[PDB]
Design an enzyme around this catalytic site. Structure first.
Site, PDB file in Angstrom:
ATOM      1  N   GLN A  88       0.806  -1.217   0.000  1.00 18.18           N
ATOM      2  CA  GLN A  88       0.000   0.000   0.000  1.00 18.18           C
ATOM      3  C   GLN A  88       0.843   1.272   0.000  1.00 18.18           C
ATOM      4  OE1 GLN A  88      -3.099  -2.315   2.963  1.00 18.18           O
ATOM      5  NE2 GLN A  88      -2.485  -0.207   3.393  1.00 18.18           N
TER       6      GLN A  88
ATOM      7  N   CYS B 270      -6.119  -0.376   2.052  1.00 18.42           N
ATOM      8  CA  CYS B 270      -6.318  -1.809   2.290  1.00 18.42           C
ATOM      9  C   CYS B 270      -7.486  -2.349   1.484  1.00 18.42           C
ATOM     10  CB  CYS B 270      -6.570  -2.088   3.784  1.00 18.42           C
ATOM     11  SG  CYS B 270      -7.579  -1.194   4.322  1.00 18.42           S
TER      12      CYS B 270
ATOM     13  N   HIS C 187      -9.243  -3.088   8.876  1.00 21.69           N
ATOM     14  CA  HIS C 187      -8.293  -3.485   7.848  1.00 21.69           C
ATOM     15  C   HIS C 187      -8.894  -4.550   6.929  1.00 21.69           C
ATOM     16  CE1 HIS C 187      -4.534  -3.658   5.936  1.00 21.69           C
ATOM     17  NE2 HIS C 187      -4.218  -4.873   6.348  1.00 21.69           N
TER      18      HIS C 187
ATOM     19  N   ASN D  25      -2.037 -10.241   2.694  1.00 20.00           N
ATOM     20  CA  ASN D  25      -2.059  -8.856   3.164  1.00 20.00           C
ATOM     21  C   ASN D  25      -1.477  -7.968   2.065  1.00 20.00           C
ATOM     22  OD1 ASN D  25      -2.387  -6.653   4.800  1.00 20.00           O
ATOM     23  ND2 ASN D  25      -1.355  -7.578   6.573  1.00 20.00           N
TER      24      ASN D  25
HETATM   25  C1  CT1 Z   1      -6.993  -0.480   5.437  1.00 16.08           C
HETATM   26  O1  CT1 Z   1      -5.725  -0.082   4.998  1.00 16.08           O
HETATM   27  C2  CT1 Z   1      -7.815   0.783   5.831  1.00 16.08           C
HETATM   28  C3  CT1 Z   1      -6.866   1.764   6.570  1.00 16.08           C
HETATM   29  C4  CT1 Z   1      -7.648   3.023   7.023  1.00 16.08           C
HETATM   30  C5  CT1 Z   1      -6.995   3.607   8.324  1.00 16.08           C
HETATM   31  C6  CT1 Z   1      -6.007   4.721   7.953  1.00 16.08           C
HETATM   32  N1  CT1 Z   1      -8.885   0.393   6.756  1.00 16.08           N
HETATM   33  C7  CT1 Z   1     -10.154   0.322   6.331  1.00 16.08           C
HETATM   34  O2  CT1 Z   1     -10.443   0.725   5.225  1.00 16.08           O
HETATM   35  O3  CT1 Z   1     -11.096  -0.188   7.127  1.00 16.08           O
HETATM   36  C8  CT1 Z   1     -12.400  -0.202   6.531  1.00 16.08           C
HETATM   37  C9  CT1 Z   1     -13.383   0.637   7.408  1.00 16.08           C
HETATM   38  C10 CT1 Z   1     -12.913   2.093   7.547  1.00 16.08           C
HETATM   39  C11 CT1 Z   1     -12.044   2.458   8.580  1.00 16.08           C
HETATM   40  C12 CT1 Z   1     -11.619   3.775   8.705  1.00 16.08           C
HETATM   41  C13 CT1 Z   1     -12.061   4.728   7.803  1.00 16.08           C
HETATM   42  C14 CT1 Z   1     -12.927   4.374   6.775  1.00 16.08           C
HETATM   43  C15 CT1 Z   1     -13.354   3.053   6.645  1.00 16.08           C
HETATM   44  C16 CT1 Z   1     -12.919  -1.673   6.499  1.00 16.08           C
HETATM   45  C17 CT1 Z   1     -12.175  -2.481   5.449  1.00 16.08           C
HETATM   46  C18 CT1 Z   1     -12.702  -2.306   7.864  1.00 16.08           C
END
Ligand code: CT1
Length: 213
Positions: A17, A23, A160, A180
């Site tokens: 990433q 993610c 994540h 991952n």
């Molecule tokens: C995965 O890399 C990301 C990282 C965001 C933190 C900087 N996590 C993620 O997208 O989790 C999403 C839910 C979420 C979390 C935070 C903000 C927006 C959305 C799901 C895949 C859990």
């Protein structure tokens, strides 16, 4: 019963990433890549950048949802390939490339919340499945080997997105084979074996989904 899509050539190399919380984009891309291989026989990298830049319903480098991604690809008539829409580790303008679409999407399906058996059935009948987990633990961030299991993992704290490319058992320990997107220097060559049927550890089955191709 166990499956390892890596052995069937349904999984592309591990990506990184970079300094971007994308993610969900990589997770979605990994899933679509699996269906593309299953459907056409070709294994190639899809563009996570295309999703980061275009999925309006998500927050690009600040987080997102795989479902929204699958919806975009379907409504958008496609997603480009990594070669046609290069990853830059930062969110930019949604760019349109006439000759860039490398895959398609007819929508998606969600795994019944918390159902690890349903997750097993999906992985087996469909292919790699996108899933969300709680990755806030040091034990997870610094995971090295064996079957990962921490009683502190919070299934109610999904932060994540990764890719379930199979499942099996190691030394009598059932597990999920997770891909991952933090580079090959993370975990075991970028992969981690996560506890399976261990009361839905880390919330592995609370937000799982795959694209319909
Ligand atoms: C995965 O890399 C990301 C990282 C965001 C933190 C900087 N996590 C993620 O997208 O989790 C999403 C839910 C979420 C979390 C935070 C903000 C927006 C959305 C799901 C895949 C859990």
């Amino acid at each position: 019963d166990s499956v390892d899509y890596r052995k069937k050539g349904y999984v592309t190399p591990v990506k990184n990433q970079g300094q971007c919380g994308s993610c969900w984009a990589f997770s979605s891309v990994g899933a679509l890549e699996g269906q593309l291989k299953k459907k056409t026989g070709k294994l190639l990298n899809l563009s996570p950048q295309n999703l980061v830049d275009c999925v309006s319903e998500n927050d690009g480098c600040g987080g997102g949802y795989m479902t929204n991604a699958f919806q975009y690809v379907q409504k958008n008539r496609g997603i480009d390939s990594e070669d046609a829409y290069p990853y830059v580790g930062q969110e930019e303008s949604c760019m349109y490339n006439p000759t860039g679409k490398a895959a398609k999407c007819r929508g998606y399906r969600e795994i019944p919340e918390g159902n690890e058996k349903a997750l097993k059935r999906a992985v087996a009948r469909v292919g790699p499945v996108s899933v969300a987990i709680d990755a806030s633990l040091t034990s997870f961030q610094f995971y090295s080997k064996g079957v990962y299991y921490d009683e502190s993992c919070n299934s109610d704290n999904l932060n994540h997105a990764v890719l379930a490319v199979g499942y099996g058992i190691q030394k009598g320990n059932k597990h999920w084979i997770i891909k991952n997107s933090w580079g090959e220097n993370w975990g075991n060559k970028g992969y981690i074996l996560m506890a399976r049927n261990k009361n839905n550890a880390c919330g592995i089955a609370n937000l799982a989904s795959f694209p319909k191709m």
